[PDB]
Amino acid sequence: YDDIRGSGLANIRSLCLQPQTFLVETFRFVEGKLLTRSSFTLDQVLTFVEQGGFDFQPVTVQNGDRVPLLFTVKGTIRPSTRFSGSFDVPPYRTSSFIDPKGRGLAVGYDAAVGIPREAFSRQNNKSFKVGTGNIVLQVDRVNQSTGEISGSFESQQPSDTDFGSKPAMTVKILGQFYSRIT
Amino acid sequence: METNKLGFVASVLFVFVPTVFLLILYIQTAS
Amino acid sequence: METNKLGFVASVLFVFVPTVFLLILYIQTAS
Amino acid sequence: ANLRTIPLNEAGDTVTLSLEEFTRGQQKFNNACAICHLGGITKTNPNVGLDTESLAGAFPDRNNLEGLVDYLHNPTTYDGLTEISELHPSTKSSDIYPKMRNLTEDDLRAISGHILLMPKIRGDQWGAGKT
Amino acid sequence: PGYDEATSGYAWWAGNARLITPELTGRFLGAHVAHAGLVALWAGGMLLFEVSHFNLSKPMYEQGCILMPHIATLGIGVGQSGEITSMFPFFAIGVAHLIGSAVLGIGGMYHAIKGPEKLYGFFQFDWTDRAKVAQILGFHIAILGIFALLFAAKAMYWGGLYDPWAPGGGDVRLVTNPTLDPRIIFGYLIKRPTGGEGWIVSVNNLEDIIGGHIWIGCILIAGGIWHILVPPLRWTYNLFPWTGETYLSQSLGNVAGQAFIAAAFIWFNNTAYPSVFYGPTVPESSQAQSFVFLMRDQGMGADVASAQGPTGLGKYLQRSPTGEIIFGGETMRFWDARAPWLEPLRGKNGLDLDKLQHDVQPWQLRRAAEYMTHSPIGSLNSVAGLATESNAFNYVSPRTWLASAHFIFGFFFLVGHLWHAGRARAAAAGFETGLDREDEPVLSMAPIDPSLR
Amino acid sequence: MVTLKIVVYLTVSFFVGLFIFGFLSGDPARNPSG
Amino acid sequence: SQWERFCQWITSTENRLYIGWFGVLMLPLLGVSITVFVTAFIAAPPVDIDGIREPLSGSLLYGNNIITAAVVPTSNAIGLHFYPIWEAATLDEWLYNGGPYQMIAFHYIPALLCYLGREWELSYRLGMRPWICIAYSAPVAATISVFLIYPIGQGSFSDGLPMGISGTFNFMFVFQAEHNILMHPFHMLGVAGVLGGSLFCAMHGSLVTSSLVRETSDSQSQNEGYKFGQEEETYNILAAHGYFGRLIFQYASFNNSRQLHFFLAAWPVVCIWFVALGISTMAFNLNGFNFNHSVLDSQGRVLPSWADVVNRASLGFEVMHERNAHNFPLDLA
Amino acid sequence: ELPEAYRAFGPLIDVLPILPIFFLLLAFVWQASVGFR
Amino acid sequence: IDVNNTNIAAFRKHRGLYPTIAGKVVSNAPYDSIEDILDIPGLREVEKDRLQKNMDIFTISDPVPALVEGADRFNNGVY
Amino acid sequence: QPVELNRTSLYLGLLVVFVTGLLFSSYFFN
Amino acid sequence: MEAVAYILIFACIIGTLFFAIAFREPPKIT
Ligand SMILES: CCCCCCCCCCCCCCCC(=O)OC[C@H](CO[C@@H]1O[C@H](CS(=O)(=O)O)[C@@H](O)[C@H](O)[C@H]1O)OC(=O)CCCCCCCCCCCCCCC
Ligand code: HEM
Ligand SMILES: CC1=C(/C=C/C(C)=C/C=C/C(C)=C/C=C/C=C(C)/C=C/C=C(C)/C=C/C2=C(C)CCCC2(C)C)C(C)(C)CCC1
Ligand SMILES: [Cl-]
Ligand SMILES: [Cl-]
DSSP: OTTTTOOOOOOOOOOOEEEEEEEEOOOEEEEEEETTTOOOOBOOOOOOOOSSSEEEEEEOOOOOOOEEEEEOOOOOOOTTTOOOOEEEEEOSSSSTBBBBBSSSSSSSSOOSOOOOOOTHHHHHHHOOOOOOEEEEBOOEHHHTTTTTEEEEEEEEEEEEOOOTTOOEEEEEEEEEEEEEOO | OOSSSSHHHHHHHHHHHHHHHHHHHHHHHHH | OOOHHHHHHHHHHHHHHHHHHHHHHHHHHHH | OOOOOOSSSSOEEEOOOOOOHEEEEEEEHHHHHHHOOOOSSSSSTTOSSSSHHHHTTSSOOOOOOHHHHHHHHHHOOOSOOOOSSSSSSSSSOOTTTTTTTTTOHHHHHHHHHTTTTTTTTTTTSSSSOOO | OOOOTTEEEOOGGGGGGGGTTTTOHHHHHHHHHHHHHHHHHHHHHHHHHHHHTOOOSSSTTTTSSSSHHHHHHHHSSSSSGOOBBHHHHHHHHHHHHHHHHHHHHHHHHHIIIIIIISSOOTTTOTTOHHHHHHHHHHHHHHHHHHHHHHHHHHSSSSSHHHHHHHSSSSEEEEOOOOOOOOHHHTTTTTTTTTTTTTTTOOSSHHHHHHHHHHHHHHHHHHHHHHHHSSOOOOOSSSSSSSSSHHHHHHHHHHHHHHHHHHHHHHOOOOOSSSSHHHHOOHHHHHHHHHHHHHHHHHHHHGGGGGGGSSSBBSSSSSEEESSSSOOOOOOGGTTTTTTEEEGGGSSSBBBOOHHSSOOTTTTHHHHHHHHSOOOOOOEEEEOSSSHHHHHHHOOOOHHHHHHHHHHHHHHHHHHHHHHHHHHHHHHHHTOOOOOOOOOOOGGGGOOSSTTTT | OHHHHHHHHHHHHHHHHHHHHHHSOOOOGGOOOO | OOOHHHHHHTTOOOOOSSHHHHHHHHHHHHHHHHHHHHHHHHOOOOBBBSSOOOBBBOTTTTTOOOOTEOOOOOOTTTHHHBOTTSSSSSSSSHHHHHHHHHHHHHHHHHHHHHHHHHHHHHHHHHHHOHHHHHHHHHHHHHHOOOHHHHHHHHOOGGGSEEEEEEHHHHHHHHHHHHHOGOOOOOHHHHHHHHHHHHHHHHHHHHHHHHBBBOOOOOTTTGGOOTTTTTOHHHHHHHHHHHHHHHHSSSTOOOOHHHHHHHHHHHHHHHHHHHHHHHHHHHHEEOOOOOOOOSOSSSSOBBOOOHHHHHHHHHHHHHHTTTTGGSSSSSSOO | OOGGGGOOHHHHHHHHTTHHHHHHHHHHHHHHTTOOO | OOOOOOOOOTTTSSOTTTTTTHHTTTSSSOSSSSGGGGGOSSSOOHHEEEEEEESSSSOOOOTTTTSSSSSEEEEEEEE | OOOOOOHHHHHHHHHHHHHHHHHHHHHHOO | HHHHHHHHHHHHHHHHHHHHHOOOOOOOOO
């Protein structure tokens, strides 16, 4: 671990998913920059059902506007075979989050307690919906001696709405993945 | 009245930025 | 930002109405 | 007075405690058990408190003095499936936890009797703390 | 003589400054030998105090001991998992210190009450006699090096030291193969003092510790022989005044930095300060909390790696800024902690899920159960449990006490070094008693104002 | 940012070298008395 | 020699501002500190202070106030890690993670050490006694305890003093919640020192002002009675002494003035030393006095005291700071 | 606890740690005895 | 208590249920049938019979997505 | 006698005005 | 326009600080 401590070697058996680009379709898909140092490895995860592992990674990418996207996937093999599928994106933060004003859904205020209801009720009553994302997994390199296949993906999943406060946008994600079918 | 907003602040600095200058010059002459 | 509009004009007369007074007093002392 | 009187067993027999005996048990609560049971709950798991409503609703009913001493003889779960005397201090298992190696039967009796002769003294000041 | 204020120049409250003068060297030696006796007096008596109030039920660090852990670290008295095998070695060292205090107290009383007021023969030093003072420096460096090599030899041959990283628990073991690589040992000196590296506080095995001690023992034997055989060179003539207060000021500054370093060692390091004896560091206690809240959720069926916090980050496990698998929560700041009850959970990427879920080897939970609820938090009147909590628990950690005390000692000694540095420079210059009224240096200086000509 | 790291390393080197070699320029002789 | 000309110019007491060898280190450190602070206080983007992807908006152009602006401390995800401009990927995660705070702090702390050394330097070049640096070591100890020593002891640079007015207030409240500094005796000494230094400053100033020698008329300032460099004493120590002695008792008023000004130096300097040290031992979680549940009645019920009421307010602060960042019930350091 | 063979000192072992804190006090005592001459 | 919206901490309230019964009734979700907890897909007989006593409180009403977003029923975070 | 304001008093007055205005600006804006 | 006031006033403090160091009234010895 001491060789990888400080380097970052982290960033069916354990299925790791390593993006290297984040195109958000702003109103075309433009590629920003990674503001969360290197913590985007969705790691240790014919049809494939989702499992445990780090099936979520919150990564804020950057006009000058931060987009905090919850990169996640919750829900024969040759060098052409693809496992196209769809996943259910949970909200960026769970309902026990509190805004700067004391309000939250599982825990928190129900209204703005600074002032004394009004046009604030879009930010007052917080919602927790679910989104869908389409992911197409390409298989390129297959090594059956170890028992493992690898390839690239493309995934389109929505970003955060701040508990229903701002219209999220879709982000395009590309990168190599590698798994051990067993 | 659809008047220039800064037309107020243009009017008053046009007429008191020189004015204080004159008073400075007068006061230092009188003393 | 829902700030006081006159808070700008309060800020600048609070800090230059005394200031010109001091400069008047200084300039007439120096001359 | 009546605060001294506590449930002994599940059969039903309110046993009275000496004031000095209760104080002696109270001290030993603060030397081997206040490491993580200080206040009324457990620091390791913030759900298994040393309160009356929790101990009466334990399986088996551990809101009794003999019940608590027998717990200290054998750490089990809140339903009593696996006798995990290793994650907990245990009167038999002195090797994992050396805190009760010097405690006799009277010490266990006194520490178990002081836990059940506060809750009508305090009320909502031991159960989970005063918020 | 020079024992009052009038014939010394020094008031009662600055009276040990009456020993500065080079004809009063016997008293200088007496004050020192008696002070060393007082140091050994405390070293004996405080250890015997710790032994006399030692309860074997509580491990060592709940007792509030600070000298018991230093001895136990040396593999004396303790064995497997830092269990006290006998209370007699601690007593033997506590009495051996008392006897040394007695002998050193007699020497300090002799050279201050009855012995020769001025030293002579080969012991007469003047502060301006720079070859002699460097020669005394050299003897002190040589004797210090032979203590450092003797400690390294004991760590290698007789007995051993307590290795907290030994296989399972950590038993006393004698270091057979210390790290003699110059690349490794002096690579600690170039590590950044910042988090992750932790310049020399992150020495984390006994081979590195004893190899560095072998190196510095040899380096100090070499420097001591150098100063006995080579007087101060011409380039060290006008660098600073060669008075006695200068020499004191330089000692003060170095030992202030040294106290700051020891505060860092007692607070972060858990190899030279094994947590069986000193209790867990705050980083290791805060990872122990996460590890025990992890093992609570194993068994009651809460899959950890798919669990989000209030913020979408990992509820128990997340990824580092480097992208390594670390414990989630606020304890992500202590992702650099390396306790030996957690290293068999360490894989390649940090905390792999493989030897985490069907790992923990039982004691590893128990140990981390112990370090969770013994954290370095407390008060002046000895209580634990945060600060805004009920007082029942009567406990403050050894590491808290030692780090607090040596930051205090480092700060006062940095102040005292600045005091004597300024005063030594001013006293040698000839203006440490005030401005000369006859001629004041500012009156003979040209004006700083650019208009003034 | 490697070039900026080099610039910072050299700038720190230059200023600390100025400090160090300036305190080996016989600084105690820079007193008013002597 | 060009080098001798340089060492003459650096150590020159002819400069309008003395440079010296501590100043040749001090000036670039201030240049970086001042540049990055003026830059970040105005235009820094929001900083992810507690490592949970909740940017805190601390700069004056991000809808923020002179009172409420702050160079926001470095992210809790960073901890005590060295995080310069070049170890980050870009110039926008460095801004996002609070790198400006660490850059300002890592140049500000050595700049104050060099300012203290520079004070000693100029004392040496002018032939005056060398201990104004000792008096200056008290605010320097205080500002290193809350910028370096508390973050080291707690484990993160996010626990440092924010570079802002309201950030400072937030630091005070969170520190009271977590350490109970008001019941820390070093802080009671610091309060005695600052309030008594203000007492003694006002007292010494009023006494020297009250016993001034008549040199002027009533229609001109009494400050014209003093001439810069005059050798004669401008006030009456005897008259101020007699007044102060009649005010309280005989053996109370300083007759001596050298002792008097040593006391004026010593009281707030020593007490600020102690309160900087108090911050520093609370950095290792050695908190103030604890008197909760200390007065019991006959049965054992806790009778509330005033320390209990202070606890209850500190618990108020305690369960609201860093709300979305404590996943376990035990906020350790 | 200290060994039973030498378990006669009792309060002596209590006194010995704070023995050096009395030497600094006796310094002020001796200086008063000479009168801070 | 509902057995598709409610956490493990509110399965304390029942007379003797913590922790395995509660750790297994929650780990598989959603349950359509109210009596689907009694099939016990991997539990033993000492779990099965004891749950068979306790059927007077269980429900299958509504899994709220704000209450299931990855270990919210196990450790919500409220101590 | 005529009124004076020397240079030092001018600088002191300017700073006290400027710093006091910077302090109270945040509250005039609210 | 609220930041503009703050930056202008801060520039006024900085100008006063420069002019009170650079162009200060010289202290003459008596
Ligand atoms: C940045 C915008 C905000 C501005 C903030 C700055 C506020 C400054 C307020 C006034 C302070 C100075 C008072 C007088 C000091 C003095 O007499 O100096 C006299 C000196 C000479 O020094 C002196 O010279 C004297 C002799 S002589 O002058 O050379 O003849 C001699 O007696 C004396 O000892 C020697 O020191 O020089 C001057 O004449 C200074 C007067 C300049 C006017 C003030 C500056 C105006 C702003 C300039 C920048 C324009 C900004 C444009 C953007 C809006
Ligand atoms: C003599 C000392 C102690 C006594 C009398 C004692 C008593 C008890 C009792 C009676 C229970 C069961 C209560 C319940 O869940 O309803 C319990 C549970 C618990 N105790 Fe303590 N305890 C002691 C020491 C400790 C210590 C020192 C720790 C610190 C690690 C600790 C940690 C726990 C934990 C984590 C639980 C919950 C475990 C579970 O659910 O089975 N105990 N304790
Ligand atoms: C010549 C010389 C000298 C001098 C020096 C000096 C004067 C110095 C300096 C210096 C300086 C003067 C420096 C500086 C600097 C700087 C820097 C380094 C900067 C920065 C920055 C940044 C990084 C920013 C950032 C940002 C923010 C924060 C916000 C917005 C965005 C941005 C990105 C823009 C002397 C005499 C001493 C002697 C020696 C030589
Ligand atoms: Cl946490
Ligand atoms: Cl907060």
